[model samples]
Target: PPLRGSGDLGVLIERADGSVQILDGTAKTSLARVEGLGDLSHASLVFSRDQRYAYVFGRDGGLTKLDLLAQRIDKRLIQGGNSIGGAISQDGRLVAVSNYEPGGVKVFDSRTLELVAEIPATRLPGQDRNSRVVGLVDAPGQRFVFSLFDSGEIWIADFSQGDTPHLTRFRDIGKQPYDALISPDGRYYMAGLFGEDGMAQLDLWHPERGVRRVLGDYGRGQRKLPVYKMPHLEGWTIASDQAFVPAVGHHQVLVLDARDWKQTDAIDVAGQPVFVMTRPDDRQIWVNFAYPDNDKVQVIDSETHEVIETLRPGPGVLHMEFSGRGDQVWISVRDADQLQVWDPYRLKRIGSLPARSPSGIFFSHRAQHIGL
Candidate 1:
């Protein structure tokens, strides 16, 4: 038997097949495919602390605990009616899923997959329906943070004090907080507004200060184009104290100053940007665009803030993820039904693997980050 650590092991979501492939990004090889995951059209997963398991949150509310070592689903259940994503606690003892159907979050025991707590997103003021929850993530001290999509609010559930959750709420944050991401250090939480020009920023270090607006005037006096797809913010977007993010509906990547949260620069691209991600070495930023321009991925030089090169691997470039220390980047081409690996430094395709409409490529390294 071959003995090895699972640090290089990652999971690839085959959305159309209701399954996921266990891939080794380092070796550029696929080891196994675990199927029977229901409705993975918008699936997301969080790795276990030991990096031995993946807790997949399916779009159909199917919560599956996959044992990577055993190459099979250890446990599975329909936790809700419709769910988006989930996060594992800092202590690795609890897991929480963000729901869009019933509009709430349910915490469960990470080990046994038992229900531990249920938190319903606050009902819309003067309305009967519960607001859909988004951006649910685990923070330091075993705390859970999330945004209320319709009611414009943010909530924190502190599990450090034991079984009873210490709930804290921040209301009237923005018109509609679509999605959010926390800084790697766990100091800042920023949410993109779908109904406004600005984004909401919450200083996690000092919650008493409340939420503040950032990039407030980005679209002022300008006609906003139809947003085919919303941008995603992840912890890896930060490079050397600067955050490179996709413009909501424009073909540009906006750079923000980490010091004061101010718009610093904008790098215009070929199309409406989707995910503007930085390589691990902080030397380059890789960006993917919305539908019409989804076939190309642009590389931006970190220092110059300019598009250095554009590579057209295939259609439907859904997601991009750097493996190890930026040695290789694995991208999921959903339309082509292929997972292509690239050498970011050389700007060339290095390897490829067949996937059934893959959308997300998550590595075990994500287990160490604050927000994945």
Candidate 2:
């Protein structure tokens, strides 16, 4: 956590018992445990602007707001029957969630867990309104952008004018958009489609230019492999001028020229890639993969765009999180039930934390950045 006061820093580790442990970063000890969150198997977390409040989004649609300083649940609400994840507005006033059950998005006031707006996944006319929404991210200008899985559309909700949010729907963006990402500069939104060969790209600065398909025929003409796991779009990284994207159903990461949106190179990976996450400094990109190969991780240099080193930290390396601006990275080993710390530069283990079936690790500093 990045609260102004000293010793307010820590990592919120979701435990298997439907409780969360606040691990003190400085002391390397458990600060407190808050419980009652449901179905965290596919859970996600986001922090408040001051890094004092943590918003835990559960797969069962349970949203719990916890005060990091007090180590207690301030408010908890089940906004939907099922939720994929959530994002806090850049201004920290609104928290938005992408839902799956009823197929829509719900917005709430950050201070009070009250529903302010609801945008159903009904933009696609003459179709089933219940479409799962994923790849939710808070963009600049008080707006939240996301992808509709069944509807094949990208919806943007503008919350600039209080609770009544204005919506901009871009239909037929892609098929089965498993996830999406916003560029580091917050200018472009890219969606990774599961039902097609290519990805959809939209420039926020010029949405009128419309969604453009990039990586021409990258997945076309190729026999679809029996995917054991679905790749995630959150790992897409924008380094300087190139974007490293995980190739769906392929064992390669597609690198594209960010300026012209052309395929420049493809970095062959060990297995089907899941997340192609870059270090905070944008110096290297760390990649994880689907099962049967999820235990190992690879590092790629931003300058050379080549695989630098490969390390097998532990079994079921589900997620990784870096320090605010430090060299160390914390990784979650689900099967091992521990969090491993590493020096990405040296590829060495430095510390470890005992966690129970942990999946996602989030730091409070993420509250200060855009598109986290």
Candidate 3:
């Protein structure tokens, strides 16, 4: 919860009474403490596209709006979703949020804090019944909304303009579409489906074409308990047509050519990888390990498809994110509930902040909030 336009991060601390403590940079020692969103085990905070107000999502399905200028809770709206999975807009007009319980997406006005639209989880005709959205990301141009939920399908909804999006269905390319990402060019999107087969890759060409291909069936057949509670199907990246997938069970990032949908290379990641983000400069791909313990952010040399160096931030590194320039890098350590910042070029740890069970990291260049 970094302060928008103020170069500060907000620390939401869960107290024993099921209440939260909101701490900001203005605090001298323990000052700037406010009570809001009672007993929230988790919260997803994001700044408005204009970086004026901060939106906070609580575990109790509460969406609280905080006025950055006023330094207080402005209002609490009905988030209505289980998990705040996604937030961001290309036009910078709307913030899309994904919910886990109802298994749908909700769009809100970034500035006015008004509900714009709702996209729910649904089963397509002839598709498996238990599909739900778990991952979401805006495309390059913000013209498309790619949602990865259940049934190994990436729902492509057109949000180019107008009041509502023209929801398009892309089916049957994966087993369980767990997470999805759009290419830098907006020409394609890749989905990593984790189900019985472990991981499936689906290609997005257009609304009419739907899913063009499913490549690299890598994960070791799914189980009821999976040995691990949640697998690392949360990771995927699109470099040109090559979709670099972190096949956790396979212990490798399966690179698939998105155009022909064929295996180009299998980059062996030493540990179970979590999330990945391609640098804006397009030099290296940063891979983070979430499970089986992570002490470093593994840097992969994209040109050679090799793990070059371990960007170690001491201990318990779970995820990493980059800003628009790719110079500043933020890594989330789940065990410590802290975020460590680093300079990518120098590969040096620069800053650290106390957080609470941060699983995902998002950097907002639009809001100018470096670590969100």
Candidate 4:
């Protein structure tokens, strides 16, 4: 008898055996083997807004389409461009690949595996070159923004099906625009400088209206693990009309109001935290360690901006996803060959699914569940 595939929740495991394992998210057991993915070692997987498909891209320029239901490899594409990372559109209609070697990005159709358009970039990674090279970000309202890593510039591209997308550039006004974030309401785009002393906040609608400084000279406390260094603004996030900046130097999370571009508050975190994620209800924020083998997460209260709880299972954690119910946070303990689940509000360790190198996660909005 053929087993039922209905309403079955699973985790797509990036395995050492060179195939992805579809495991039950609740039972810590293998549900099915998504076979013949054609080598995902050191690559990233982006699942669709619906849970029906998984798109796997390798650092070697191998992009593959996978069948999530029948657990089989679907289409293998040669997006033969990027050496590092690529991203798909929110609607899963387009796939964008970044060429770190030549320093450009190419867009493709997700279904037909067609190269739709290629956008050339300014910054190629040579010391003699002066441009800051950034990858493509498919931002809110179907607006696509490209990041310039070196020159500290951001180019905005608005996608229209028929006409050529309009291109506009915004100056970062800071050195090394390493990363940026957009608010849920799509009101602002906040960018963080890698080695600089500050981060910049931009009005999404009016990039020409000029840039705003979200936080500056975010200094670290005395007792933090990573001792004094230049303010390395590693990551930033925008949630509920606020910008959350995490820095290696500061050892804290800077929460700023997204509307007025003002610093609302800050809180102490552990181990030079790099990434933060807010729950669906906007009540709690989850933070992860920056470096030095500390694979733990801390929960912060959004309303009060305080450290509420700590979640630690072991080392080698990379990615996480929250289930639609808002009760559980699914973590990809990648190198540890496991997936850990935690309760967001109580911060209690709820459940786990065992797997090898579970590197990516996402909630399915259209299929079996909804986390939209």
The candidate that wins on TM-score is: 1
- The TM-scores of all predictions, comma-separated, are 0.94, 0.90, 0.72, 0.79
CA RMSD of all predictions = 2.1, 2.8, 5.4, 4.8
Clashes of 2: 1
At residue 180, give the lDDT of candidate 2. Answer: 79
Give the per-residue lDDT digits (tens) of candidate 2, residues 82-175. 5756899989999998877578888888999888888888644565557888889999999999988887899889988878988899998877
On the 0 to 100 scale, the lDDT of residue 342 in model 2 is 90
Candidate 2 pairs with clashing backbones: 1-10
The better candidate by lDDT, 3 or 4, is 4
Over all chains combined, what TM-score does candidate 1 have? Answer: 0.94
Off by over 4 Å in 1: 125-128, 219-228
List pairs with backbone clashes in candidate 4: 132-148, 132-149, 132-150, 132-151, 133-149, 134-147, 337-355
Ranking by TM-score: 1, 2, 4, 3
lDDT of 3 by residue, 1-372 (tens): 442344343334332233333323323122244566554555556666655556666666667666655567787766554465455666667667777656677777766668888787775566443345755666544544545555555665567766498777666666666555555555555555456443333344445555544554544554454524344444666667566666655566777776766778888776766666677676788887654647767788778888878766656675666655666776767567666667788887767766555444543343642112
Provide the overall lDDT of each model, using Cα atoms, as 2-decimal numbers. Answer: 0.84, 0.80, 0.59, 0.62
Model 1 C-alpha lDDT per residue in residues 277-353, reported as the tens digit of each score:
88888888999888889999999998999889989999999999887688889999999999999988888899999
Q: Which candidate achieves the best lDDT against the true structure?
A: 1
Model 4: per-residue Cα lDDT over 1-372, one tens digit each: 145443335446474655676655445456676655555566655566556676677755777777666777778775444643455565567766666545556677878767777666675454433353443455665566656776677776666552255677776467666655555555656565564645566676777787776557543323333322433222355665776766545577778776665677778887776667778788888777656635878888888888877777677777667766677777778767777777777777777766767765544332321111
Ten residues in sequence with the least summed lDDT for candidate 4? 363-372
